[PDB]
Amino acid sequence: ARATAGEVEGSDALRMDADRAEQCVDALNADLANVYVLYHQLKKHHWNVEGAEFRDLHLFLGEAAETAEEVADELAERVQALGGVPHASPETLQAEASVDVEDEDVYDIRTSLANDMAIYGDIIEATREHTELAENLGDHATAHMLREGLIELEDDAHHIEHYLEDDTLVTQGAL
């Protein structure tokens, strides 16, 4: 094997010592797992959503899934850049993830959306801390990246929050 899961040789090219590096690699790899299960959950809801606002949510969730995948790729590559070994197998990703994943059953859209909002929140708070950890460790590049992705994650979470709000054009009459 060229590398062993868990090891963090740092990077000479990036002038990042394995000491500072390991701190980020541990933070980043934690997020990679959470974002990737988020990815798979958003896909799930993307595939299953039904109802009156089905097509609108179908496209929204699709985009959200895509954003998650891009964010995940950014993390995984930043880890590998810092000399680490990013989580890879689906099994490892879920194991390492600290958020709540739904059992293989299919729930109504409000429940599902509500569950995703929950995953977003955890990832959003974990990420805010990691950017500080990065700015403090002097790793401005990683900090910058995290913010760039954070901005996207927060917009998707806020959208889910608006979908769940208590308003509508539907009137008891039209029912």
Instruction: Select from 28-36, 49-57, 98-106, 157-165 the region that touches Na ion (CB under 5 A).
Output: 49-57
46 is in an annotated binding site: yes
Q: How far apart are CA 99 and CA 3, in angstroms?
A: 28
Shortest distance, position 73 Cβ to a second copy, whole Å: 7
Q: What is the torsional sign of CA 65, 44, 120, 62? A: positive
Q: How far is CA 84 from CA 15, 16, 139, 164, in A?
A: 15, 12, 15, 39
Near Fe ion by CB under 5 A: residue from 9, 18, 80, 135: 80
The reply, when asked if residue 161 is annotated as ligand binding, is no
Q: What is the dihedral of CA 114, 117, 121, 124, to 10 degrees?
A: 170
Kindly state the helix (H) or strand (E) to which residue 172 belongs, with its residue range.
none
The residue (of 23 and 60) whose beta carbon lies closer to a second copy is 60
Among 5, 52, 95, 164, contact with Na ion (rule: CB under 5 A): 52
What's the CA gap between 94 and 103, in Å, rounded? Answer: 12
Residue 128: CB partners within 8 Å, gap ≥ 6? Answer: 150
* 166 labeled part of a ligand binding site: no
Give, as ranges, the residues between 143 and 172 that touch Fe ion (CB under 5 A): 148, 166
User: Among 14, 26, 40, 69, which residue sits at the site for Fe ion (rule: CB under 5 A)?
Assistant: 69
Residue whose CB is less far from Na ion, 53 or 155: 53
66 binds Fe ion (CB under 5 A): yes
Yes or no: say if 27 and 77 are a contact pair by the CB < 8 Å rule.
no
Cα 52 to Cα 131: distance, rounded to the nearest angstrom: 39
Q: Shortest approach of a second copy to residue 123 CB, angstroms?
A: 10
**Contact set for Na ion, span 53-72 (CB under 5 A):** 53
- What residue 106 binds from Fe ion, a second copy, Na ion, none (CB within 5 to 8 A, per partner kind)? a second copy
Please give the residue ranges that form the binding site for Na ion (CB under 5 A).
52-53
Residues that bind Fe ion (CB under 5 A): 66, 69, 73, 77, 80, 148, 166
